[PDB]
Amino acid sequence: KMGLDLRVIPLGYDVTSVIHVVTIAIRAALIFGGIKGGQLNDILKYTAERVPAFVNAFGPLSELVVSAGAGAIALGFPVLTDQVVPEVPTLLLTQKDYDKMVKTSLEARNIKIKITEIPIPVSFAAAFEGERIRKNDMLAEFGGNKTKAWELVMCADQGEVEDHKIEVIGPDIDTIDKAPGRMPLGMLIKVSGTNMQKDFEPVLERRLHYFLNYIEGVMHVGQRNLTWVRIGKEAFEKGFRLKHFGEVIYAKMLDEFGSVVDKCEVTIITDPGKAEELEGKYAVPRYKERDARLESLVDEKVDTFYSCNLCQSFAPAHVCIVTPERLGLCGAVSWLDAKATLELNPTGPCQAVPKEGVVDENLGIWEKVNETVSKISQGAVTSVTLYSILQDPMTSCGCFECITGIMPEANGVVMVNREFGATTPLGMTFGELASMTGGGVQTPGFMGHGRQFIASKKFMKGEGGLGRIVWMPKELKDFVAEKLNKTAKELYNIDNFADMICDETIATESEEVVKFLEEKGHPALKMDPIM
Amino acid sequence: GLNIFKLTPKKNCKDCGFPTCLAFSMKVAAGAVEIGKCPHMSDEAMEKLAEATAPIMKTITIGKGDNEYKLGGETVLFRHEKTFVNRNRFAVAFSDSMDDAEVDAKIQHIKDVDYVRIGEQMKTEFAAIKYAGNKDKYLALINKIKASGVKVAYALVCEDVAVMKEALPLVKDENPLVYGANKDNFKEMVELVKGDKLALGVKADGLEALYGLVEEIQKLGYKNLVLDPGGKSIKEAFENTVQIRRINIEGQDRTFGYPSIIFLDELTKADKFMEVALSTLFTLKYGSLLVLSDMDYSRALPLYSIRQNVFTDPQKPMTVDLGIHGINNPDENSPVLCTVDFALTYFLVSGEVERSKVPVWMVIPDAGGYSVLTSWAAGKFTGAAIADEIKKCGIAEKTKNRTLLIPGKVAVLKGELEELLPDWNIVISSTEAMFIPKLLKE
Amino acid sequence: KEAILNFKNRDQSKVMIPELKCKAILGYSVEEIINKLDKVVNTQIGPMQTVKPLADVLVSGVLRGAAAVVGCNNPKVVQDSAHIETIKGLIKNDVIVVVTGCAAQAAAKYGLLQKEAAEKYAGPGL
Amino acid sequence: FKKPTQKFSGKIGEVEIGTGEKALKLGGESVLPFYTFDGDTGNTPKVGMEILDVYPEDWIDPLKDIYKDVAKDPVKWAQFVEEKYSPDFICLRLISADPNGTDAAPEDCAKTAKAVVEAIKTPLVVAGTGNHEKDAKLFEKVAQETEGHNILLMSAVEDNYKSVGAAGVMAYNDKVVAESSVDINLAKQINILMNQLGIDNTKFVDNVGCAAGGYGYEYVISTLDRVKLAALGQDDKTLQVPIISPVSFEACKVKEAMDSEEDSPQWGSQEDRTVSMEVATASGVLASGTDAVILRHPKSVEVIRNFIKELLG
Ligand code: B12
Ligand code: SF4
Ligand code: SF4
Ligand code: NI
Numbered sequence A: 001k002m003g004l005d006l007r008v009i010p011l012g013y014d015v016t017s018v019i020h021v022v023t024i025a026i027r028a029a030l031i032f033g034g035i036k037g038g039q040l041n042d043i044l045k046y047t048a049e050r051v052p053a054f055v056n057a058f059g060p061l062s063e064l065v066v067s068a069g070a071g072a073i074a075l076g077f078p079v080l081t082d083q084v085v086p087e088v089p090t091l092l093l094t095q096k097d098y099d100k101m102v103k104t105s106l107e108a109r110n111i112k113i114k115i116t117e118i119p120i121p122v123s124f125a126a127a128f129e130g131e132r133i134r135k136n137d138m139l140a141e142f143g144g145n146k147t148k149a150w151e152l153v154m155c156a157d158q159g160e161v162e163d164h165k166i167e168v169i170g171p172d173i174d175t176i177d178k179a180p181g182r183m184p185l186g187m188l189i190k191v192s193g194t195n196m197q198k199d200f201e202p203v204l205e206r207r208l209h210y211f212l213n214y215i216e217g218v219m220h221v222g223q224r225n226l227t228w229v230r231i232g233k234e235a236f237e238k239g240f241r242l243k244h245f246g247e248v249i250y251a252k253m254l255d256e257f258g259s260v261v262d263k264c265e266v267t268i269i270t271d272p273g274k275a276e277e278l279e280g281k282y283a284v285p286r287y288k289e290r291d292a293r294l295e296s297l298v299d300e301k302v303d304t305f306y307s308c309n310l311c312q313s314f315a316p317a318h319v320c321i322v323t324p325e326r327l328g329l330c331g332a333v334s335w336l337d338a339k340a341t342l343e344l345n346p347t348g349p350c351q352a353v354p355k356e357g358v359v360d361e362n363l364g365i366w367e368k369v370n371e372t373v374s375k376i377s378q379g380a381v382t383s384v385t386l387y388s389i390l391q392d393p394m395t396s397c398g399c400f401e402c403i404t405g406i407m408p409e410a411n412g413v414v415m416v417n418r419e420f421g422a423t424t425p426l427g428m429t430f431g432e433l434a435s436m437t438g439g440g441v442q443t444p445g446f447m448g449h450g451r452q453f454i455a456s457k458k459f460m461k462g463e464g465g466l467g468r469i470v471w472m473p474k475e476l477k478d479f480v481a482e483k484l485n486k487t488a489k490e491l492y493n494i495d496n497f498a499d500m501i502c503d504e505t506i507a508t509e510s511e512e513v514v515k516f517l518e519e520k521g522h523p524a525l526k527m528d529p530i531m
Numbered sequence B: 001g002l003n004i005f006k007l008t009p010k011k012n013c014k015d016c017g018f019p020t021c022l023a024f025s026m027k028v029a030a031g032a033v034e035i036g037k038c039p040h041m042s043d044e045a046m047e048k049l050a051e052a053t054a055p056i057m058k059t060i061t062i063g064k065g066d067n068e069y070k071l072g073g074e075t076v077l078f079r080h081e082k083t084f085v086n087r088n089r090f091a092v093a094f095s096d097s098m099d100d101a102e103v104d105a106k107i108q109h110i111k112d113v114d115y116v117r118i119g120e121q122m123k124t125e126f127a128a129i130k131y132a133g134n135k136d137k138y139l140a141l142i143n144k145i146k147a148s149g150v151k152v153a154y155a156l157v158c159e160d161v162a163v164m165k166e167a168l169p170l171v172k173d174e175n176p177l178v179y180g181a182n183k184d185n186f187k188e189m190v191e192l193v194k195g196d197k198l199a200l201g202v203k204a205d206g207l208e209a210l211y212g213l214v215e216e217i218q219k220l221g222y223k224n225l226v227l228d229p230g231g232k233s234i235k236e237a238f239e240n241t242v243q244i245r246r247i248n249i250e251g252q253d254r255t256f257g258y259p260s261i262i263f264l265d266e267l268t269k270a271d272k273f274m275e276v277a278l279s280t281l282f283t284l285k286y287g288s289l290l291v292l293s294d295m296d297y298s299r300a301l302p303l304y305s306i307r308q309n310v311f312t313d314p315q316k317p318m319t320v321d322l323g324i325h326g327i328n329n330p331d332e333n334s335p336v337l338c339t340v341d342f343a344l345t346y347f348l349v350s351g352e353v354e355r356s357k358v359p360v361w362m363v364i365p366d367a368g369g370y371s372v373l374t375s376w377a378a379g380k381f382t383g384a385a386i387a388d389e390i391k392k393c394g395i396a397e398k399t400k401n402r403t404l405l406i407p408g409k410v411a412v413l414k415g416e417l418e419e420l421l422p423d424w425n426i427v428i429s430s431t432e433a434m435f436i437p438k439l440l441k442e
Numbered sequence C: 001k002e003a004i005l006n007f008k009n010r011d012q013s014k015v016m017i018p019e020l021k022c023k024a025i026l027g028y029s030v031e032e033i034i035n036k037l038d039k040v041v042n043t044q045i046g047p048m049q050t051v052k053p054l055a056d057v058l059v060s061g062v063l064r065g066a067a068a069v070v071g072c073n074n075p076k077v078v079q080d081s082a083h084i085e086t087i088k089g090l091i092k093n094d095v096i097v098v099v100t101g102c103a104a105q106a107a108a109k110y111g112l113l114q115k116e117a118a119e120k121y122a123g124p125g126l
Numbered sequence D: 001f002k003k004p005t006q007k008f009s010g011k012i013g014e015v016e017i018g019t020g021e022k023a024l025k026l027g028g029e030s031v032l033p034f035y036t037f038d039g040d041t042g043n044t045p046k047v048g049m050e051i052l053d054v055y056p057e058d059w060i061d062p063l064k065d066i067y068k069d070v071a072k073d074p075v076k077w078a079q080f081v082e083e084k085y086s087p088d089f090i091c092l093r094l095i096s097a098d099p100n101g102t103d104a105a106p107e108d109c110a111k112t113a114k115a116v117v118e119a120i121k122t123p124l125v126v127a128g129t130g131n132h133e134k135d136a137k138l139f140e141k142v143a144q145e146t147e148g149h150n151i152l153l154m155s156a157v158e159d160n161y162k163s164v165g166a167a168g169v170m171a172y173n174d175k176v177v178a179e180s181s182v183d184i185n186l187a188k189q190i191n192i193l194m195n196q197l198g199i200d201n202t203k204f205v206d207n208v209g210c211a212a213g214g215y216g217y218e219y220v221i222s223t224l225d226r227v228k229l230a231a232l233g234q235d236d237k238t239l240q241v242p243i244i245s246p247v248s249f250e251a252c253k254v255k256e257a258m259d260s261e262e263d264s265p266q267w268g269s270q271e272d273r274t275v276s277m278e279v280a281t282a283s284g285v286l287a288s289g290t291d292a293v294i295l296r297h298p299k300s301v302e303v304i305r306n307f308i309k310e311l312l313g
C-alpha cells in the first residue's frame, strides 16, 4: 500500500528520479539545518550526520547507477546492494541474503527501532514498584536462604551476543507442583556496543533491580549472588513465564541504555548444575575484578576527574569534584558512576575535568580544576584545594553524613556523624556544624563528606593525613575501623589505630580528650601544628 | 571565622556561655553575637576584633517588646547569595491635615487587617504620623492614635524641631522613629534623640548631599540612623535606594550602612495598585520601611505573602513541627491524614481540612522540608518514612479509626505501606487539595 | 642495581636534557590490525577477524596501496630527513604506511604516529 | 563616595515575535532590570493578555462580566481584547486540549488558533496544556496551521523538546518557549539541548518557572536572579535568551484571588484581590529579570504598564 501517510513513495521508473529523494535530504539541510545555499560542505556534513538515509540497489547495476550511488555516498548515505561490487567498508556493501538486507541496512545506517511495547502479558509500569506479595500470593521464590540465585550483566563482543535472543535453560515455573517452590535462578545479560565498556557493567546491573520491580507479580531485591526474587501466583495465572524476564530486560536495556548498548542477549538458567557452572565461570570473576578495580584506583593513575553540580538546587555555589579516592560527598556518586553518567547522560550533572596545569600535587591544586570550579559555580568559588581542609577547601551542600572539624588544642580533627545527636569535643553539635559547613560556602577548618572518604589515602593529605583524626563516635569508628587501620598501618603507625582514637564512651570534653591522646601516644600530638 | 580564633585567648573557660573558644569564634563570625562577650579578651585584640566583627550594615531596633522590629543587618544583594536577614516593615501614614472620619477609618483598617499565615502574624507594623502645619492638631492626632488601642510602633515625621520637641515625649517611652533631620537642624535632632538612643531619620536632596549629611551626623557621634533615599519621582527614588544599598554592600562603605525609609504614599499619590507594585519592588530591592497611604486585605495578602517568601533562609526553609496535629478538635475516632514537613504544603492541607470542619488527626513525618513530589523524586518521601513516623509518633492516643489518607500525587508508595502497616487501612486519596474538603465531608 | 647505584656519580652541572618529546601510538601487530579492522565490518555480512576490510579498501581504490618504511640512519643522508619526507609523500598520496625500526622511531619523534596526523598529512582516502 | 559601576560582559539576546508593525522584541539588556543608571535596557518589558478558546467558566465573576459578550467566540474575544486594551501580545491558551479535562483533537485547536491568528495584528502566543504527549501533537498541528505569522509556542519542555522544536522553529519559522522548573541548571540543560538540535538563541525564549506570590515565589525569584547574574555577570552564552513568565496562569487560581466576597467577607472585593495578586506577582518577577508577562485582568495590565513606564522613564 503506497502513500505519503503509508510511507511508501514511488518516485519514478527512471534512475534520475532518485534525485527527488536526494533533494529531500538537501532541503532538510536548507530548511531545518538553516544552511545557506552554496555552503556545500556544511550541507554534505548535515546530510551525513542528520539524515538517516541509505540505498538498497537491487538487480544488475549499470555505470550510471553506480555513479548515482557515489552521489549517495557523497551525501554520507551508505549504499547496499545484492550485486558483486568493489566494496568500501561502511559505504558500499554487498548483501546477497534478502532475508538480512533490512538488518544489514539498519546496522550500516546506525538506525535503531524503538520497541514501543514489551511483548509480555503482565502489566509493566513504574506504579507497580514496591507492591510486596505475601506467602499467600506467592508462587515461586528464588535466592535467599532457600536456594542460590545470581544476576550478571557482562560486556562481550558482538559475535558472542545475539540480538533479541531470549533462551531458558532447564525447567520453567509451569512444572512447579503449584506449591511455593525453590529452584536456582541464574540471570545472564550479555551486552555489546561500540561505546560500551566494562566500567559501565555495574551501572546497568543496578537498573535490573528496578526493571524487574516494575512488573506486577514479581519482586527483585538484592545484588550479584545475593539475588532475592519472588513471583506471585497471579502472575502464573495471567501467563507469566521465565522468557518474559528476558523480554522485559532486553526491552528496558535497549530503551534506557540505547546510547551504549547495541545488542542484548538474556539467558535464564534454572538447572542446578548449569546455574552454578555459569556463576563460577562468569559471575564471581567479574565481581572480584570489579572489587579490585574499586580498591586499586587512585588519583595518580587517572587523568580526568568529574564535576557534579546536582546539589546546586539548594547550594547554589557548591561544586563536587569526584576523584577515584575522593567520592561525591553525598556518598552515592563515585568516579566510575560519574564517568557512566557523563557517557550515558551528556549535558547532565556530571562533566569531565581534565588534570591540567598541576600546581601542588601534595595539596591537590590544578589550574584546570580551578577553572572548572569557577565556571560551574558561576564565579562564586574561584580556587579550590582537593586534599586540604584549611587552605581553599571544597564546599559542602547538605547531603553529607559526616562532618570533619578542626580541633587545634588536640592538634588534630574531630569527626561527627548525622545519627550522632550528642555533643562533641568541639562544642557544636551536628546541626550547628551542618549549618556552619553546608550551603556551598568555603569554610576553612571544616568539611562535609561520606563514610568512605575517612579511610582514603587523600583524606587530609595536605595536613599530614588521617593521623589527625583524634575523636569519632563509637558507631562510626566500629564501621570504619578495618580500612582506617589498614590505611594507618600504611601511613606510619601500628595497625590498631582505631583504639587510640577517642569516642563518646571514653570522653567528650576538651581536656579529657587531650589527656587521653597524650597518654595514648597519638601521632597527631607529634606532627607540625595543624594551623 | 577561624581567623578570630587566633586572636581569642584559646582558653575554654565557658565564661562567654558558648562551649568552646572555637564555638565563640564561629558564633560571632556568623554575626549572631558581638565580640564583647569574652571577659578575658586581650585589650589590643579586643579592639581589633571589635573593628573586625563590625557588620557592614547596622541593625536598627524600633519599638518595645510586642512591637520590637529590627531593620537592616543585610550582607548580600541577592537572597540566593547568602540570605536576607530582616524583613521589611510597613507603615500606615497619618497626617494632621486629615478629617477625623479618615483617621478613624485608617485606625479601623489597621486593627481589622490582622491575620496569621504559616506561623507569622501579618499586621500593620508602624504608624507614620506626619506634621502638616498645625501643632495642636498634630498633638491631638498623636494622642488619638495612642488612645485608639492599635498595637503599632510609631514613626514621627516632623522636620520642625520646635514641634518635635513637644511631640516626642508623647511617644518617647515606646522607642519611636524620629524622622526629620536636615542639613540645618541635624544638631538639634541629634540632641533630641541622643539621650534615649532613638532612631533618627535622615533626609536630603540627592545621594551626595545625603552622604555628606550622614558623615556630618556621624562626626557628632550618632549611629542610630534610618536613611531617606529621597527622589522626586519613582525612577529617582528606586535609583537612590539601589545605589545606597550597593554602595554599602559592594563598596564596603559603612556610611550608607543603614536601613532606608521609603514613602510610597507620596510617590504613588495614594494609588493602591501602584502601592502594591512598588511595595513588591522595594521588598525585593532594599526597602526597609515602606510607608503606605492605607492598608486593606488587597494590599496585605500579596505583599505579606511575598515578604514571607523572600525573607526565608534558603538553607533552612520553613518546616512545621513533627508530631500529631489536631484539627477541628479530633476525638478518639477521627480519620488520620498524613502529609510532609514542608510549611507551604501543611499550610494548604490544613487550610483545606480546617475548612472541612471534620475532626481529622494529622501526622507529619520528616520528609526533609520538601513538597510531596520534590521530596519523593529526591527519595526522601517514601512509605518507609511514613511507617516509621506513624509507629513512633504516638497515634495510639486516639484509636478506632484506621482509614489513613496518603498524598495522591504519589500513588506508587501504596504497595509498601499495607505491608508495613497491616492493621492500618492505607488510602491514596485525591491529588488536588481542593478535593480534600468534600472527601472529608463524604 | 649497578645502573641505579651509578646515579650517585651524576654531575647535575653537566646535564642538559632538551625539552623535546613527542607522543606516539604503536603496537600494531597483525592481530591488532585485524582487531581494529573488525570495527568497519558489518555484523550482518562479516566475516570477522580477517584482513578483508583492508583488502576491500585496497581493491576499491580508496587506498592506492600500502608501503613499508624500514631501515637505519646513515651519515650520508641528513638524519631522519629521507624517512620523514618519504612517509609524508606516501600518506599524502593515499598510501597507508607501516613502519619498523629506526624509520618507525623517526616517525615517532616527528609526530606521525598520532591519530591527529591523519587530518594533518594524509590524503582524502587515507 | 564612589558610584557603584560594576560592568557586565554579557548581553541578553533579542527574539522577535509577530509580524508587521505590531511585532515585539524581547531581550537586549546589558544590566539588571530597570537599572537605567548602570547602563542600557535593550527592550522594554512587554505585557500580554490571556484568552481561552472555550468559555472561561472557572474565572471570577467580574472577568466574566468584562467579557460577557465575546468570551463565547475566541476570534471575537481576541478582537475585543485588541480593540479595547491593545496589549503587546495575546496569549491564546488551548485548554480544550487538556487530557484531564475536556479532550479535543489537535485539528480543532489548530483551527481555532488559525482563526484567531488570521483576525488580529498583534503577536500571538499559543499555550498548550501541561501534558507533554498531548503538547507535541497539538503544537505540530498548530504550527502547521498557523504558518507565516511568527507565533510563540509555550511549554517546549525537555520530554518533547525535539517535537515542539522541529514543528516550531525548524519547520514553520515560529518561536518557542523552553520551559524548566525553578532550576538554573535545568534551564541551561534545555537551552543546550535546543542549541544542539540546531536552534539558535534568537529562535526561542525561556520559562524558568512561575508561581503566585506566597506559593514558592522565592524559588522563582532566586532562579531569575541566578539566570540573570549568570547571563550578564559570567557571560554564560547558554542563558542569554529572554525570559517570559505567565503570571495569570498561577496568580489567578489561588485562594486569595479566587475567593468571592461572600466566601471571605473580611477580605473584601474579589476583583481588587485578583488585581492585587496579579500586580504583585508580575512586579516581583519583572524586578527579578523577566522580559514578558501574561496578565488576565485588564486593570492589572494597565497597572503593570504604568509601573514599567514609571520605572523606565
Ligand atoms: C519549588 C520546587 C522545587 C524547589 C522547592 C521544593 C520544596 N522544598 O517545596 C527545589 C529546588 C528544592 C526543588 C527541587 C527538586 N525538584 Co522540584 N519542584 C518545585 C515546584 C516548582 C513546586 C513545588 C511546590 O512548591 N509545591 C507546593 C506544595 C503545596 O505542593 P505539594 O507538596 O505537592 O502539595 C500538593 C499536593 O501534594 C496536595 N497534598 C499535599 N499533602 C497531601 C496529603 C494528602 C493526604 C493529600 C490527599 C493531598 C496532599 O496538596 C497540594 C496541592 O495544593 C514543582 C513544579 C510544580 N509546579 O509542581 C517542581 C517539581 C515538583 N520538582 C521536581 C523534581 C523532580 C525535583 C528534584 C528531585 C530534581 C529537579 N531539580 O527537578 C529536586 C530535588 C531536590 C532535593 N534535594 O530534594 C519535579 C517532580 C517530578 C516527579 N513526578 O517526580 C517537578 C514537577 C519539576 C519538573 N521538572 O517537572 N523543587
Ligand atoms: S553531593 Fe553527590 S549529588 Fe550532590 S553535587 Fe556532589 S556528587 Fe552530585
Ligand atoms: S569567654 Fe572567651 S576565653 Fe572564655 S571560653 Fe568563651 S571565648 Fe574562650
Ligand atoms: Ni550534595
Ligand code: NI
Pocket (backbone or CB within 6 Å): A311, A330, A396, A397, A398, A399, A400, A438
Ligand atoms: Ni549535601
